[PDB]
Symmetry: D3
């Protein structure tokens, strides 16, 4: 009960701050959907290019799944940074 | 004219790929609006806490504007990574 | 009251998870002290090298305050990542 | 012998600078221990939640091992940035 | 045809800007070669240290392939940032 | 004298490893030159667009100097990661 009071640096948040944080998280939800769509596109592209050594080598050299993972991580950590700017913890 | 053909590694893009890229960029637009809103909130919070040395010191110690900048950069570079996964350049 | 229940993706945490999170944050406190010490060292180094154009140019070219800021940000975001691994939010 | 004189940009370091660098590295050691502890916790959590499809899916969706790896990398690169601020190499 | 006009925020580029971008990309090519060389060195080091449990454990603990991957990603995203500074898109 | 033996985790390096590290650093030197060139281009672009409120606002909105700084930091930390993969320190 009231676990946030037990975590160092966590202060009480107004409803306004909570709403802004939840807004960040909902925009992140939309980004989650978009990333899933891109991953599906990559599956389909690779599949359709099966037994096309040149196209398969092109895709493998571009490393699109690795770049999608990088982008996902950047989106999530940017979300976390914005939420930190809103919530403003009391600790380093 | 057709400048993309003059840049190393840039290949021709299908309309599908262009649409996915533009989708990433529009979601980024919404994030731009959200970040502007958070910055306005920070302006108002600081202003309202003028001549409240304790609250001013708290805000300054939390560094919310620096964290908002960090989050903005992360969102933008994640956008760039996702767009790279879609467009798949031909170069390192 | 119980603000964590109002934030999307935040689940109830056991006392064990809270303790691990607080541990991350206390180690971060020690890092805060170390970074303050390094910043003091940089102040003193610059001051002692006043009116020594060569040493001043060397320091300015090395950009140690910018690198200290980079390191601080990395430590803080790594702390945030570890705390996320512990708390395991329910959202993207 | 004296390999640091053979590496571009590496200058001679005072004992004070070496001590500060070693301090950064020892704090990093403590972080290494903490990360090992968190990884053990994750092993135990997953194991205890074996044959609990809902809890297993929750953990898998949270990706805590990936976030622990992200945090480890951030801690290490922040350490490297702080050590660079101390040692101040002579090269880009 | 003229796909860049269909992507949000992409403006027309002068030949000067295109040349600077291509310069960034060619320097990146040289970095690609250097990273391949380092990876070959790591293969050879590991191979030569086969059936030397101590050296194998040392290498595994240092995680040099993971650090090479980190460095590759940093080089590529720095390239992307510089190219963005040159091309200056019109969108967030 | 032999300061590297006094820093935790630093092992003795072969001449091969030193040469690879110095190679990374020389490529970084070339990147330093390229970044200086881009910064000069940005100075000239801004200057030439003086008293052209529209072009000045465009440049300011694109934030090219901030993106150049981001790219510089990424190049430098990628260099550091590659050099770490080569030198392979003995510490976290
Ligand atoms: N005004 C303008 N800006 C441009 C243009 N092309 C790129 N940019 C900018 O520079 C970045 C490109 O960096 P990059 O070449 O290292 O990575 C690019 C490149 O790898 C890929 N890409 C872009 N256009 C492509 C294309 N036409 N074909 C193939 N891949 C392409 O998408 C990546 C991310 O694009 P982005 O829109 O997020 O960032 C742009 C964008 O901010 C351009 O034509 N005009
Ligand atoms: N003052 C204050 N600041 C808070 C509070 N909750 C979060 N913050 C701050 O914003 C960050 C949360 O960002 P996030 O929601 O994107 O990631 C959070 C979230 O994914 C997770 N987490 C935090 N509280 C949780 C909880 N109660 N349940 C589940 N997961 C939780 O831990 C991550 C990192 O926490 P952190 O302490 O390093 O950074 C906080 C912290 O700096 C809060 O209640 N009060
Ligand atoms: N002037 C000066 N600067 C130094 C010296 N040693 C390191 N630095 C600087 O601090 C960084 C070292 O941080 P680190 O100890 O966390 O990571 C180091 C360390 O993990 C590894 N390394 C460096 N010298 C080593 C060595 N002698 N043996 C083994 N590993 C070594 O290389 C990493 C990256 O080196 P770098 O040259 O890119 O950055 C240096 C460099 O900018 C040094 O002797 N003199």
């Amino acid at each position: 009960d009231n676990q946030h009071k037990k975590i160092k640096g966590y202060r009480d948040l107004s409803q306004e701050e909570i709403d802004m944080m939840n807004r960040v998280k909902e925009l992140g939800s939309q980004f989650e959907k978009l990333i899933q769509d891109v991953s599906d596109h990559l599956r389909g592209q690779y599949n359709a290019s099966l037994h096309n050594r040149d196209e398969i080598t092109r895709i493998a050299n571009a490393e699109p799944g690795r770049w999608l993972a990088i982008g996902k991580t950047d989106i999530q950590t940017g979300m976390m940074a914005i939420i930190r700017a809103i919530a403003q913890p009391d600790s380093f």
